[PDB]
Design a protein around this ligand. Structure first.
Ligand SMILES: [Zn+2]
Ligand SMILES: [Zn+2]
Ligand SMILES: [Zn+2]
Length: 178
C-alpha cells in the first residue's frame, strides 16, 4: 500500500485498502473509515465492483434520469465517491469549510453551502434523490461565482466545478455528447 493518503497526498495515520494499494486518513475517505471490517475495501474498489457486476451500467445515461434516482445504496455510494473526487483536488480547501461574506460591492449568498456540510448531509442520509446532492454541489460553485464577480478568484470555482462535472459524467455514465 501507499505511504500517503490518496485524497490529500500527505503521510500520517493511514488505513490501507485490502484490495488495491490505496491508503487513506480516517476522515479523508468517504465514508469515514469503518472501525473493524477485515478485509476492508475502499470506495474505489467498491465502485469497481459495481461495474464488474453490471457491465451495462457503463452504457450511456441521460442526466435527467440520473438526477431523479432515489439514494439507494449504490447511488449513495457514487455520490460519496464523486464528493471524494472533489476533495482529491487541492483547490477543494477553498470550498471545505463554512464561508463568510463581507466584500465591498457584493452581498452574500442567500443559501451558503460548503463541502463539509454536504459530506455531513450524505453521512446523515438527508438526500433522498441524487438531484439533492448534485444541487448542493452545484450551489457551492454558483455561490462562489456570484460573490467574487470579476475578481480573478472566481476562476477557482470554475476549476473545481470542472473537476466535479467530469467526475459526475464518468461515475454515473452520462451519455457522451458534443
Ligand atoms: Zn488525507
Ligand atoms: Zn481499494
Ligand atoms: Zn444484471
Amino acid at each position: 500500500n501507499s505511504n500517503i493518503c490518496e485524497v490529500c497526498n500527505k503521510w500520517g495515520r493511514l488505513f490501507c485498502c485490502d484490495t488495491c494499494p490505496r491508503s487513506f486518513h480516517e476522515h479523508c475517505h468517504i465514508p469515514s473509515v469503518e472501525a473493524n471490517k477485515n478485509p476492508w475495501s475502499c470506495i474505489f474498489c467498491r465502485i469497481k465492483t459495481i461495474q464488474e457486476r453490471c457491465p451495462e451500467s457503463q452504457s450511456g445515461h441521460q442526466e435527467s434520469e440520473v438526477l431523479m434516482r432515489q439514494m439507494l445504496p449504490e447511488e449513495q455510494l457514487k455520490c460519496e465517491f464523486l464528493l471524494l473526487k472533489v476533495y482529491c483536488d487541492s483547490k477543494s480547501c477553498f470550498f471545505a469549510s463554512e464561508p463568510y461574506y463581507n466584500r465591498e460591492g457584493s452581498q452574500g449568498p442567500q443559501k451558503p453551502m460548503w463541502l463539509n456540510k454536504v459530506k455531513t448531509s450524505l453521512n446523515e442520509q438527508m438526500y433522498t434523490r441524487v438531484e439533492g446532492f448534485v444541487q448542493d454541489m452545484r450551489l457551492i460553485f454558483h455561490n462562489h461565482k456570484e460573490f467574487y464577480r470579476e475578481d480573478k478568484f472566481t476562476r477557482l470555482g470554475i476549476q473545481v466545478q470542472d473537476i466535479f462535472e467530469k467526475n459526475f459524467r464518468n461515475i454515473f455514465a452520462i451519455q457522451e455528447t458534443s
